[PDB]
């Protein structure tokens, strides 16, 4: 049925969004609360997570690049890259990484994942310039411009980001066949979380 139970999803607070809205994310928005806050759809989040896992299982694991400027997402992308073999960039993204061959850390991935389209604007711009598929963790106020695969989630909460990246890594491993089943994943969820 669902990859993760409703209680765990709500505890991580994936459905919690931002007071602002967007016509692009109107299709993912569930409802608006009495205080003006918008709630996402956990069912659509789960479906898009399954789709993203299946999509990312096909790429070569060294050619996937996951980026997160946001501090709450810096640790989850590092853990996801360690688990799945993909390259991870937390913190500041050096301009010219994907467009300047003279840069010492020059690298051209086959697929990009961004924790936040607004925060990781430089990485998205360079990915657009080089012409590669883009997967974006999108919130209620985000725009789906230049986003080839959108995952509706709370891309600001620490627990939400950790759970989303843990689910994505587990699904990628399952679909790639490294783990024979979902239950074979023996990495705790708290490992992805950033420690305060």
């Amino acid at each position: 049925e669902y990859l993760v139970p409703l209680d765990q999803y709500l505890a991580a607070g994936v459905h919690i969004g931002t007071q602002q809205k967007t016509k692009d994310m109107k299709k993912f928005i569930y409802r608006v609360r009495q205080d003006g806050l918008y709630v996402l759809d956990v069912r659509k989040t789960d479906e898009r997570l399954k789709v993203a896992g299946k999509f990312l299982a096909k790429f070569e694991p060294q050619s996937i690049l996951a980026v997160s400027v946001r501090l709450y997402g810096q640790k989850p992308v590092k853990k996801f890259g360690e688990v799945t073999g993909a390259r991870a960039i937390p913190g500041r993204f050096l301009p010219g990484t994907m467009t300047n061959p003279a840069v010492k850390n020059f690298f051209e991935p086959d697929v990009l994942i961004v924790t936040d389209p607004r925060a990781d604007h430089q990485a998205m711009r360079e990915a657009v310039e080089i012409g590669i598929p883009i997967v974006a963790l999108v919130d209620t106020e985000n725009l789906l411009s230049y986003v080839d695969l959108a995952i509706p989630t709370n891309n600001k909460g620490r627990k939400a980001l950790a759970l989303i990246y843990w689910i994505l890594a587990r699904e990628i491993l399952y679909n790639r066949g490294e783990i024979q089943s979902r239950e074979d994943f023996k990495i705790p969820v708290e490992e992805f979380e950033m420690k305060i």
């Binding site: 789709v51 299946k54 012409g131 725009l143 230049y146 080839d148």
Partner: protein
Amino acid sequence: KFEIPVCTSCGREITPREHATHFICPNCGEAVIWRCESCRVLAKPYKCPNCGWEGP
């Protein structure tokens, strides 16, 4: 003579040096989805011809 790629959403041809993209369908894995620069900027949804899966 060689085949010229055609956008999946709008059905127009792809110019030589535009910021277009192409990828295997995330759902079925059989068909290939092409998106032109204008469709990518405007976030126009696309449907896979095989599964019928819709959206970016």
